[PDB]
Design a protein around this ligand. Structure first.
Ligand SMILES: *[C@@H]1O[C@H](CO)[C@@H](O[C@@H]2O[C@H](CO)[C@@H](O)[C@H](O)[C@H]2NC(C)=O)[C@H](O)[C@H]1NC(C)=O
Ligand code: NAG
Ligand code: NAG
Ligand code: CA
Ligand code: CA
Ligand code: CA
Ligand code: CA
Ligand code: CA
Ligand code: CA
Ligand code: CA
Ligand code: CA
Ligand code: CA
Ligand code: CA
Ligand code: CA
Ligand code: CA
Ligand code: CA
Ligand code: CA
Ligand code: CA
Ligand code: CA
Ligand code: CA
Ligand code: CA
Ligand code: CA
Ligand code: CA
Ligand code: CA
Ligand code: CA
Ligand code: CA
Ligand code: CA
Ligand code: CA
Ligand code: CA
Ligand code: CA
Ligand code: CA
Ligand code: CA
Ligand code: CA
Length: 622
């Protein structure tokens, strides 16, 4: 009777009584609950927590009737609850899983490519890379038999990709720089005449310049047209300041105005000529800037002069106590991004923005308000370049390190492991591929060319190839280099041969890939030399950590890929060696914590014409 006049909020049940009076009971599950006047319920706030929070707070939206979860944010995948009502809210809860296109097998990498997970917060979260033996952009991979990252033919990958998709100009000889000076499609490395001037480039005194007459004023055997000091003798053509004018014929080799003899750092540009300790050697080239030492002797080759050098490095990261910005905690790269003097590794706020590391969506880039206006768990300020060194995550070999972005051995320290008088034949390094390929030429004393970038966790991989048939001795690479008495080395001999110096101790070098660690109590010299050559332990010198029990040696003219894995925090070390696309050797997991990181470098011991091609190092915690 009285319920005909719809007096109860729509959705509510209207009870009508015999005397025309009525009562409002229900409220449409989703509304407050007076009966007649009924308002919207907030299933979200002040009730449960049934939407997935991205480490933020605002994930549940409230609607007029009912409620609505927000779809899992970027980097996540899952359901998206929708409900009208109050009992629909306690039951049903949003579940988001962290994406992983590799382990999810949802990527689109070539059948001969690898899906490589780049880390949860990485931009992007993954990439495709062609496997050893192949080359391309990752969506398309072709044959790469010399393992230099360039394939044998152009691929449909050609015009929409920068590298790795154009025909290798020396299909059988590693030349990952692909330098082809005369542009005749035959690359320099395998070109009989690199300038097409008709003078075969072994007899050409200007390999990379046209000059058929071979005009050579001074007979330093570097023709006039390419000679940077055409009138003075200078076969090495060294040009410190790289201005076309060679050191030889220059009164200022480093172009800092301060003339050579006056210059207290003649090889290093320094106009203020500061000489704190007054030893005649300027700060920018003093390996002991606070301590007197004109001679600058550095017997363990760690770039710290003997007078400074006390070797006391209590956390084995290779930086001695008085020079380690985290004296007690291992940090070989000494990364200190906010420059406050307190090393990242022992610093709770790496960018000094107020928000500590373990709660910061841009750990390296100052941003106290944590703008993440797209909900990807990463601050929009460090959107594509987590370390803000202007090189983006995908192209960054150390995405969480503003001091490394590219593999670059262009500047390297030459570490002689057995120096003497004559009979001292030093290695000879040629640089190509802007520092990503080195060739050792001579039959030399043991030696390393160590690069300067420093690492903790690291992956180091290179192509190994001996472009000659003379000899059967050692090559390889060092890692964790700290001093010439402290480093991990991987070396590989072709034919087992006992070293030709009985003294100090006999050394039997077997064939196969070797993993050694060096803790030498004498430093560079005969004892260490033999110890390096010797397959096995040598007290106070070298400890072999693993050696391919099959003793397989390397073959001539044969491309190998090495891959180093090193995680000093735990001491994990793993060495892969590929022959073409097939794993030929694998150290399995190894454990050694002698050194908590350090530098990378390339190692030779009495083997000439050794090609270390297409080198890549990456930070694998960084
Ligand atoms: C490398 O070896 C050196 C010496 O061979 C080690 O230094 C010695 O460590 C022993 C512990 O077994 C101490 O008793 C000695 O006092 C040390 N010798 C001196 C005076 O230098 C050193 O521990 C090793 N370095 C590492 C493992 O990083
Ligand atoms: C019918 O609806 C109107 C709503 O204004 C209400 O005033 C009236 O009391 C209802 N029924 C009765 C009891 O006459
Ligand atoms: C890259 O460009 C080429 C141009 O023809 C195309 O064939 C290729 O499929 C492109 N890559 C992708 C993402 O499909
Ligand atoms: Ca609601
Ligand atoms: Ca190739
Ligand atoms: Ca090649
Ligand atoms: Ca050429
Ligand atoms: Ca050539
Ligand atoms: Ca040519
Ligand atoms: Ca020539
Ligand atoms: Ca020439
Ligand atoms: Ca000349
Ligand atoms: Ca000259
Ligand atoms: Ca110059
Ligand atoms: Ca100068
Ligand atoms: Ca100078
Ligand atoms: Ca000085
Ligand atoms: Ca000094
Ligand atoms: Ca030193
Ligand atoms: Ca030292
Ligand atoms: Ca230290
Ligand atoms: Ca430290
Ligand atoms: Ca700091
Ligand atoms: Ca930190
Ligand atoms: Ca700080
Ligand atoms: Ca911070
Ligand atoms: Ca920040
Ligand atoms: Ca963001
Ligand atoms: Ca970066
Ligand atoms: Ca970087
Ligand atoms: Ca040989
Ligand atoms: Ca030999
Ligand atoms: Ca030799």
């Amino acid at each position: 009777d009285g319920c005909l006049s719809n007096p109860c909020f729509p959705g509510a049940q209207c009870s009508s009584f015999p005397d025309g009076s009525w009562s409002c009971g229900f409220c449409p599950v989703g509304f407050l609950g007076n009966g007649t006047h009924c308002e919207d319920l907030d299933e979200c706030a002040l009730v449960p927590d049934i939407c997935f929070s991205t480490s933020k707070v605002p994930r549940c939206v409230n609607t007029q009737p009912g409620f609505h979860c927000l779809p899992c944010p970027p980097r996540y995948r899952g359901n998206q609850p929708v409900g009208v009502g109050l009992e629909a809210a306690k039951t049903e809860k949003q579940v988001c899983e962290p994406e992983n296109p590799c382990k999810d097998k949802t990527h689109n990498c070539h059948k001969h490519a690898e899906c490589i997970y780049l880390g949860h917060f990485s931009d992007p979260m993954y990439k495709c890379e062609c496997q050893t033996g192949y080359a391309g952009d990752g969506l398309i991979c072709g044959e790469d038999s010399d393992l230099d990252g360039w394939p044998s033919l152009n691929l449909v990958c050609a015009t929409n990709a920068t590298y790795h998709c154009i025909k290798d100009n020396c299909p059988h000889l590693p030349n990952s720089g692909q330098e082809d000076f005369d542009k005749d499609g035959i690359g320099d490395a395998c070109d009989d005449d690199d300038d097409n001037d008709g003078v075969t480039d072994e007899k050409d005194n200007c390999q990379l310049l046209f000059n058929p007459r071979q005009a050579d004023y001074d007979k330093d055997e570097v023709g006039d047209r390419c000679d940077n000091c055409p009138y003075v003798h200078n076969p090495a053509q060294i040009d410190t300041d790289n201005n076309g004018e060679g050191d030889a014929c220059s009164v200022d080799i480093d172009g800092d105005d301060v003339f050579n003899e006056r210059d207290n750092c003649p090889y290093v540009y320094n106009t203020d000529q500061r000489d704190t300790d007054g030893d005649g050697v300027g700060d920018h080239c003093d390996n002991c800037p606070l301590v007197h030492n004109p001679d600058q002797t550095d017997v363990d080759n760690d770039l710290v002069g003997d007078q400074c050098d006390n070797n006391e490095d209590i956390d084995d990261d290779g930086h001695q106590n008085n020079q380690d910005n985290c004296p007690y905690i291992s940090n070989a790269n000494q990364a200190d991004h906010d420059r406050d003097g307190q090393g990242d590794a022992c610093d709770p706020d790496d960018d000094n923005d107020g928000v500590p590391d373990d709660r910061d969506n841009c750990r390296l880039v100052f941003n106290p308000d944590q703008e993440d206006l797209d909900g990807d768990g990463r601050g929009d300020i460090c959107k594509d370049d987590f370390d803000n060194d202007n090189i983006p995550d995908i192209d960054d070999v150390c995405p969480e390190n503003n001091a490394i972005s590219e593999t670059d051995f262009r500047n390297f320290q030459m570490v002689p492991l057995d120096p003497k008088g004559t009979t001292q034949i030093d290695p000879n390094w040629v640089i190509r591929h802007q520092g990503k390929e080195l060739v050792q030429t001579a039959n030399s004393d043991p030696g390393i060319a160590v690069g300067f970038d420093e690492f903790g966790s690291v992956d180091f991989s290179g192509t190994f190839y001996v472009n000659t048939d003379r000899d059967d001795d050692y090559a390889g690479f060092v890692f964790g280099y700290q001093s010439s008495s402290r480093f991990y080395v991987v070396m590989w001999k072709q034919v087992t041969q006992t070293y030709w110096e009985d003294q100090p101790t006999r050394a039997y070098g077997y064939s196969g890939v070797s993993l050694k660690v060096v803790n030498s109590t004498t430093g560079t010299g005969e004892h260490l030399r033999n110890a390096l050559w010797h397959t096995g332990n040598t007290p106070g010198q070298v400890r072999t950590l693993w050696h391919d029990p099959r003793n397989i040696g390397w073959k001539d003219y044969t491309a190998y890929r090495w891959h180093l894995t090193h995680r000093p925090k735990t001491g994990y070390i793993r060495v892969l060696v590929h022959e073409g696309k097939q794993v030929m050797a694998d150290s399995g997991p190894i454990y050694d914590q002698t050194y908590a990181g350090g530098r990378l470098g390339l190692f030779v011991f009495s083997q000439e014409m050794v090609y270390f091609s297409d080198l890549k190092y990456e930070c694998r915690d960084i």
